[PDB]
Amino acid sequence: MTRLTVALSGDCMVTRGGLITSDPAAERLRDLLRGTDFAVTNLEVVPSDGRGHPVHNAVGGGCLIADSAVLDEVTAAGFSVLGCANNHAMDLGTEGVLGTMDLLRARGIPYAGIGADLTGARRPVYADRPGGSLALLSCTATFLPGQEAADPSPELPGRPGLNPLRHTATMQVTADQMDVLRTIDAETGLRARRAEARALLGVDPALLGPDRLALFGTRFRTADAPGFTTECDPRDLDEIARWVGEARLRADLVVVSVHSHEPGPTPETPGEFLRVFAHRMIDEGAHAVVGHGPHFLRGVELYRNKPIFYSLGNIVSQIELTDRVSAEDYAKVTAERPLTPGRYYDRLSGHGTRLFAPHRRYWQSLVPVLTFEDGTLTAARLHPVDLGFGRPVHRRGRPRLADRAEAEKTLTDVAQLSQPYGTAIEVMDDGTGELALDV
């Protein structure tokens, strides 16, 4: 009875107008997005009319701030529900994120993942249309500590911020490797500098057990063979799952959007904690999990007949076209004269010989279009997107439906990245495809 379509996409790093060019392949992407009931993207940029102050985000690759007019580019392109939790929503601080919420609400754009407090960032947003409703929840595993939103206390307000999915990494080391680490701790004098903390706290904060260790701000555990494990923060995982169970009661479809740069054993595999997280979301009743962060595609998994897109890469990539570069960002490039933004990005990438420009994986994208009937996935179309690899810097990063030859190559990539999950793909003559479903 109820039939709904959802378009998914990755990072929307838009800094300029004319997002949809006069290219027919770009206009057909807008037609595709505007033909769906809901079209989701990750707003990977701070739209601003001037509120807030730049934070030091060198780890994130600099500040990502744009004129608020780019929001009209996003909506006119067809995107209608925004995920906002990512490592850039806080690029203008708490005042910036409050400014973003003001800008989105005044334009009537449904959004999730940020809020004036932690609950508001965790909440789903409900997008209602004549055919039905979609609940979007948005969280991020990549952010600067402290940027997560905070709930109020009886005496103090909350803190505006993002919806966090924290996680811990543990280094598994052999018993002899652990002994050397403790020896380094004692012999360098590092242990001596915790003598004060021992008296105040009553014990050494580095001793978590005789086979567990916290040194150099890292977790070490004795194991038979060296290894590396990651685990979700239990409180974030339980709380996000809690809100998914809430959203499932109040919407036809529940989509969880999660930002995650963290790599697994290989750059193309997701962190193990992310896979546990995605499984939990569907266990709690989500109909899809859309991931992003790495700026390249990752595999697709079908779990209990619901799709997990571990990374849809970038749908818009205009980092190097930003006109708002902070002083701390400029300082990362030695210069014998004050730099303009474009020259700064040219020197930052070594005139295009490093960073994202040389590699083609950073300029292919994918827009899945999912069809649900009463919550059952009945189709998952795959539309490869081309972002213009090798074009001049002012042209690349704008999305268009890839031509047949490039779409087939992208579809092969997705199939190969999805093969470890048992995912199969049917391929159309035009280079588009769709997931093979059990339903």
Binding site: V59, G61, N87, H88, T142, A169, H261, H295, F356
Partner: peptide, 7 residues
Amino acid sequence: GCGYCFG
């Protein structure tokens, strides 16, 4: 704060 993340 990223441990073992651009853009």
